[PDB]
Design a protein around this ligand. Structure first.
Ligand SMILES: Nc1ncnc2c1ncn2[C@@H]1O[C@H](CSCC[C@H](N)C(=O)O)[C@@H](O)[C@H]1O
Ligand SMILES: Nc1ncnc2c1ncn2[C@@H]1O[C@H](CSCC[C@H](N)C(=O)O)[C@@H](O)[C@H]1O
Lengths: 511, 511
């Protein structure tokens, strides 16, 4: 029923579609291995379809045989028994090859296929390969987190000292050894209903900085809370503002928003003042837009998101059926900050592409058309990712690229949101996300003030006590919702440590 | 057989000797609670000995009763059943007190005593309280790790790029996707026997930086190893030296030692050149001594070690039997860097104290007397902590303070070393340690070159693949070896996160 034969260079297109165990695929590298050792690499075919393939190498002065790569085609039905059959063939065929003594390390491959864990295995695509190269060679590849995230770190350290003083101004945490239950602080602080969960997240900020001990049933103030808070808000905030504005000017927006929030936090938390009157002063959306451009980490993720979608569009422009334009949709495009850098990128291909600038709020789609009315190929629509496509007049499975920049977490059930995102794309379409992926303090002070931050009803798939997902949780939920080829991206210095990354661009593909 | 009664201020001396569940004891605070509510605090006595005590508070507009502290005397035999009896008394006595509705949260105290975990519970002493205050108010309390450890971080980042190039110069890791087993690199790199385990630790450095994937059976080079290494050692090291020397001049010694090592690392690792000829150039011990003074983190830990021992000496000078002098011993005093700041501190009390400057090597005791011959009260002796006291002419249980600054890990079995340390002290004597407590890269490059780093035979009580112990492992082994009142100290900003601290002063007491 199936055939084992030598790989050839003619098999390279199909080998590039495989999941790989040791490293991402690489067209020019498969070429060189097949040119240098044309009878060292076996594949297994079943009805013309490629199922599994094994590349070997000879090592240790030519006496032991090693596996250099194990490729599998996971969408073939019984592939695990077939890949086991190819493994056992290679062992037999390898020990009797001229000169070999031993086959090195087959048990790891046997275990990998029988207990299959899709996230261990690399997958590849032109897109994956081009983004890794870009990250590897980026100007920021030489710097480390302490340099790159310094502004965020120092803002968050100061803001936490302010936040403890805000609690002390509302009557709690002046002394070490106070004992509360969380429900009792909600009452004693008179937190309005909408912000009771935000209070949990704010307590959690102080917990991670050693100010409070939060346990199953009780919040307990520790010794460090006697000395940690700011002592004079007005003069110390003024002094920090001067220091921070001059030293990290590109982060001025973050400092301004956090300043405007904390200054009025007791009244905001008690429900006595609205946040749109305090921080969204007089429809000053420009302040809020600058949170996400202008500084080198934010521009790095924007460049990563935008180049990825640009590359994917050119990949699909290389296809001869033509006909329908390539349709891109951006969910929650907002003030169109990252959108603007992408439209400039795609603008060369304006006649084959169709770009939908969308947001749940009519306010932001009209903001968008005010900024992009010169682009004939950008269309505007209100769209809510949590609401039915039909009711919103959108054909399912009609988009090639869906873009969502830090919006998808502001929903009730992340599995329903990604299903709906899946419904947007046709098979092979590309999901492109930019997400904060740690429960970062900086985001709570203002982002936690908005209602979308607290819709979530599936905490089992979120971090700590907020609405964010980590890289692993995103990988889990994206696979659960019918995406594969998931590519999580962080700063270059943490590509090996993304489970702790604050921010991440994630691409994924509908299968 | 036992009596439950109200605490009084006359019980405060004995209450200070208890383990506490919520926070460290505090003499002036017990005073104020007993003055304000003289009938709110119960204790349990058994044959005049204090066993357990409970301080309560009324909360929530005077309707619920809470436990403010639970004190226990763990050296009393059946104390856990006695403390349960006092808990159950307090519940009965509390619900019928005038005005109270409910007793808040007794189940946590019940669980704490029946499943006793000594390291949860605070313990106290004059020493503990004074060091917490010092840390809390220290000039460094306002800074965070990224500021304080910047020099170490940047040195370690550069040194790792150099180390990968050192491997590439010895023939491995030029390409992504190479597969080795650890035994096979030992052979292929021709590592001399003494440094085979150091090779493991060096591979581990690159593992944590994403250069290599180290698994049960194999070392696998990743993509990042194509671009990470220095490209021209001579010019890039020169450029870094200039940058680093001018920016962190107080760390010049660390950069010099790492430079001298890595420059000759292949020959050092192959056994072709000795490390004392390369880094200990011509008996230049001053270079090596400056590793541990001169910069603000190192001086902070020295100040913490020295003030702690100074305080403990003055505590014991407040005792009227007098007679024998207070005898201090420093294990592995080395070049006496921290010793010099301590002798200046103790020099006021020179006539009641007797200080033993000791080291395993006669070279370092003579170095010591060259530096401290002006102090009549300092005695010199070669001493090996791993060797028998009797054979070395030292009375057991004769010392009041034993000091060991980053030496105790350089031994074969940490439990035998702490037992021997225990044998030095009389009951109530003080162990004072300064230890690196993460498997830090910086220390491997040169410290890993010395044989004492590799004596250890109990990896189950060490970190990763070196000889260090973390804070929790130190707490475990110190308790296993007969010490209590264990006080782990780190930088002020991490007193709540010491399981990740790079360096720690630890005091402990012989019971
Ligand atoms: N359920 C939902 N469906 C579609 N858009 C949503 C949404 N919930 C919130 N949004 C929109 O997403 C944004 C929240 S985060 C804004 C990020 C945006 N990319 C920007 O650059 O501004 C808001 O503008 C909001 O209008
Ligand atoms: N088993 C042992 N017993 C006593 N001293 C030891 C020892 N092993 C090593 N030493 C000594 O401890 C030192 C190793 S670390 C040196 C730290 C020392 N406090 C200083 O400031 O220099 C060396 O000087 C060595 O001579």
């Amino acid at each position: 029923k199936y055939q084992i034969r030598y790989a050839t260079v003619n098999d390279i297109p199909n080998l590039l579609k495989c999941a790989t165990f040791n490293q991402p695929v690489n067209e020019p590298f498969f070429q060189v291995l097949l040119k240098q050792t044309p009878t060292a690499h076996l594949l297994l075919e079943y009805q013309g379809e490629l199922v599994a393939a094994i590349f070997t190498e000879t090592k240790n002065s030519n006496e032991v045989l090693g596996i250099r790569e194990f490729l599998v085609r996971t969408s073939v039905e019984n592939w695990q028994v077939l890949a086991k059959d190819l493994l056992e063939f290679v062992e037999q065929w390898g020990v009797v090859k001229p000169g070999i003594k031993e086959i090195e390390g087959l048990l790891k491959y046997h275990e990998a296929i029988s207990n299959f864990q899709k996230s261990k295995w690399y997958q590849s695509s032109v897109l994956n390969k081009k983004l890794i190269e870009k990250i590897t060679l980026h100007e920021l590849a030489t710097l480390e987190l302490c340099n790159l995230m310094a502004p965020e770190y120092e803002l968050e350290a100061f803001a936490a000292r302010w936040l403890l003083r805000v609690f002390q101004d509302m009557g709690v945490f002046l002394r070490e050894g106070e004992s509360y239950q969380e429900s009792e602080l909600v009452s004693q602080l008179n937190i309005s209903p909408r912000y009771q969960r935000l209070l949990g997240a704010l307590l959690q900020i102080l917990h991670k900085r050693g100010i409070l001990k939060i346990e199953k049933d009780r919040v307990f103030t520790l010794a460090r809370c006697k000395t940690f808070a700011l002592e004079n808000i007005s003069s110390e905030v003024s002094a920090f503002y001067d220091y921070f504005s001059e030293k990290y000017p590109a982060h001025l927006s973050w400092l301004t928003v956090v300043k405007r929030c904390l200054e009025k936090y007791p009244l905001i938390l008690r429900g006595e003042v609205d946040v749109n009157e305090v921080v969204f002063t007089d429809g000053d959306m420009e302040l809020f837009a600058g949170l996400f451009l202008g500084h080198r980490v934010a521009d790095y993720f924007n460049e990563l998101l935008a180049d990825g979608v640009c590359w994917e569009v050119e990949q699909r422009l290389l296809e001869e059926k033509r006909a329908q334009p390539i349709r891109i949709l951006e969910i929650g495009a907002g003030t169109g900050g990252v959108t603007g850098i992408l439209l400039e990128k795609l603008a060369s291909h304006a006649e084959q592409i169709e770009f939908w600038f969308t947001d749940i709020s009519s306010v932001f789609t009209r903001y968008g058309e005010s900024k992009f009315k010169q682009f004939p190929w950008v269309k505007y629509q209100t769209f809510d990712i949590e609401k039915s496509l039909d009711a919103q007049g959108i054909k399912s499975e009609s988009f090639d690229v869906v873009i969502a920049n830090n919006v998808l977490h502001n929903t009730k059930l992340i599995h329903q949101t990604l299903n709906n995102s899946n419904s947007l794309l046709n098979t092979g379409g590309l999901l492109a996300l930019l997400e904060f992926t740690q429960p970062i303090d900086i985001l709570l002070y203002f982002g936690g003030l908005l209602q979308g931050f607290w819709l979530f009803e599936d905490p089992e798939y979120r971090l700590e006590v907020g609405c964010l997902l980590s890289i692993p949780l995103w990988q889990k939920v994206l696979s659960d919702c019918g995406f594969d080829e998931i590519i999580p991206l962080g700063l270059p210095c943490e590509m090996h440590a993304l489970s702790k990354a604050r921010e991440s661009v994630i691409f994924a593909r509908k299968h």
